[PDB]
Amino acid sequence: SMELQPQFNEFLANIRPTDTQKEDWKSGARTLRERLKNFEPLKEIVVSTFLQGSIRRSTAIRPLGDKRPDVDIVVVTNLDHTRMSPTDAMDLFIPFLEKYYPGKWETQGRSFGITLSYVELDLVITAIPESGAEKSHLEQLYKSESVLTVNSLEEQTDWRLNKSWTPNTGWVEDAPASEWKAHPLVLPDREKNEWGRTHPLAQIRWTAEKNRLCNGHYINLVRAVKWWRQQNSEDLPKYPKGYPLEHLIGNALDNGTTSMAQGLVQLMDTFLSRWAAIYNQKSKPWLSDHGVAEHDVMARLTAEDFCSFYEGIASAAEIARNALASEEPQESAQLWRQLFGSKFPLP
Ligand SMILES: Nc1ncnc2c1ncn2[C@@H]1O[C@H](COP(=O)(O)OP(=O)(O)OP(=O)(O)O)[C@@H](O)[C@H]1O
Ligand SMILES: Nc1ncnc2c1ncn2[C@@H]1O[C@H](COP(=O)(O)OP(=O)(O)OP(=O)(O)O)[C@@H](O)[C@H]1O
Ligand SMILES: [Mg+2]
Ligand SMILES: [Mg+2]
Ligand SMILES: [Mg+2]
Ligand SMILES: [Mg+2]
């Protein structure tokens, strides 16, 4: 078998967001947090502002050309979601946005977009559904370094969801589930002025654990498959992409991964075998979200798109198998380049 580890490392470096982008979202997120914390009308309402999404989980890929990466941010408030609607909560942030980001922000349904120099923030306003002392204890978690760090999982592979965790200087386990697992936040629905549930911290925690169980290869494999999808967009369905695609990859990948090349072939093979019956039925899987267990991550994916995507994976898997089985490094790399394009280097 052929692993081409140095070529995969260079490929991954080429598809991660750039260091200029990274520094822009780190300063952008922290600056937003500090501005909200000191904005008098919101000082008693905002509990926490934290980095989330693929940027936080180190599963984001570099956008093409001059396009700005999407950087997801949660604002946690102490508002009572049974007495205030999502728009009531969002209404409060307009004067803040006009003061600090004039001409640079836009409402996009359930979120606010903010254009920075090199990145685009995607801000969602949330609330803690619990009340009283139970709310207070959850607020302590959202105020902890575990939550407030602006470093991503790749930079803190030991990260744990625990108010007592502190960053490793280079020189603690997850908190018991009883303290966080059954406690999602509420956020605005995509389309309706109604609250839904989301648990980004639980998704981050699951990703961190899966990455440790996969010897650091999981988050890199998500990026690689996302890159394949982007490079082959014209031959693939529009969906899955984004988080549902990441979730499918985390499902398909087995624990114990030892290399990128082996992991790609394993996860594609497992995808094809696991979903063979569903594909034969022209259906799609129902997959429990790692954050809100009762939610189907695939709820908006059509069966037609799932089955078209299955066919795309089938084609990719044949190439990936041949690359791993190749005896000549140049042939192997040329096969990976059929999936990934020119950002995967020849040896
Ligand atoms: N279908 C879904 N199920 C569960 N969580 C979701 C789903 N769609 C979005 N999310 C949550 O909202 C976050 C922001 O969504 P977004 O579309 O920006 O995805 P992403 O994972 O950041 O990927 P991208 O790199 O494409 O932005 C996700 O990271 C995830 O936590
Ligand atoms: N920007 C976001 N940040 C955090 N979580 C998100 C975000 N966008 C979506 N989610 C999560 O993804 C789930 C699915 O969101 P999606 O936009 O696909 O449909 P929805 O109609 O809002 O979901 P539902 O009505 O099923 O709650 C949400 O319930 C929430 O848990
Ligand atoms: Mg995102
Ligand atoms: Mg987003
Ligand atoms: Mg909905
Ligand atoms: Mg699995």
From Swiss-Prot:
Its EC number is 2.7.7.-. GO terms for biological process: defense response to virus; nucleotide metabolic process. It comes from the Bacteria. Keywords: Antiviral defense, ATP-binding, GTP-binding, Isopeptide bond, Magnesium, Metal-binding, Nucleotide metabolism, Nucleotide-binding, Nucleotidyltransferase, Transferase. Its cofactor is Mg(2+). InterPro entries: NT_sf (IPR043519). In bacteria expressing cap4-dncV-cap2-cap3, this protein is conjugated to a number of other proteins by Cap2, probably via this protein's C-terminal Ala residue. More conjugated DncV is found in the absence of Cap3. It catalyses: GTP + 2 ATP = 3',3',3'-cAAG + 3 diphosphate. Mg(2+) A binds at residues 70, 72, 122. Binds 3 Mg(2+) ions per subunit; 1 is probably structural, the other 2 are probably catalytic. Changing residue 189 to A: Slight decrease in synthesis of 3'3'3'-cAAG. ATP donor binds at residues 54, 57, 70, 72, 203, 226, 243, 297. Mg(2+) C binds at residue 189. Primed for activation by Cap2 which conjugates it to cellular proteins; activation is target protein-specific (green fluorescent protein does not activate the enzyme), but which protein(s) activate it is unclear. ATP acceptor binds at residues 52, 110, 189-190, 197-198, 300. Induction: Part of a CBASS operon consisting of cap4-cdnD-cap2-cap3. The active site is at 70, 72, 122. Changing residue 72 to N: No longer makes cyclic nucleotides. GO terms for molecular function: ATP binding; GTP binding; metal ion binding; nucleotidyltransferase activity. Has an N-terminal catalytic domain and a C-terminal helical domain. Belongs to the CD-NTase family. D02 subfamily. Monomer. Crystallizes as a Cap2 homodimer bound on each side by a CdnD monomer. Cyclic nucleotide synthase (second messenger synthase) of a CBASS antivirus system. CBASS (cyclic oligonucleotide-based antiphage signaling system) provides immunity against bacteriophages. The CD-NTase protein (CdnD, this protein) synthesizes cyclic nucleotides in response to infection; these serve as specific second messenger signals. The signals activate a diverse range of effectors, leading to bacterial cell death and thus abortive phage infection. A type II-C(AAG) CBASS system. This is Cyclic AMP-AMP-GMP synthase.
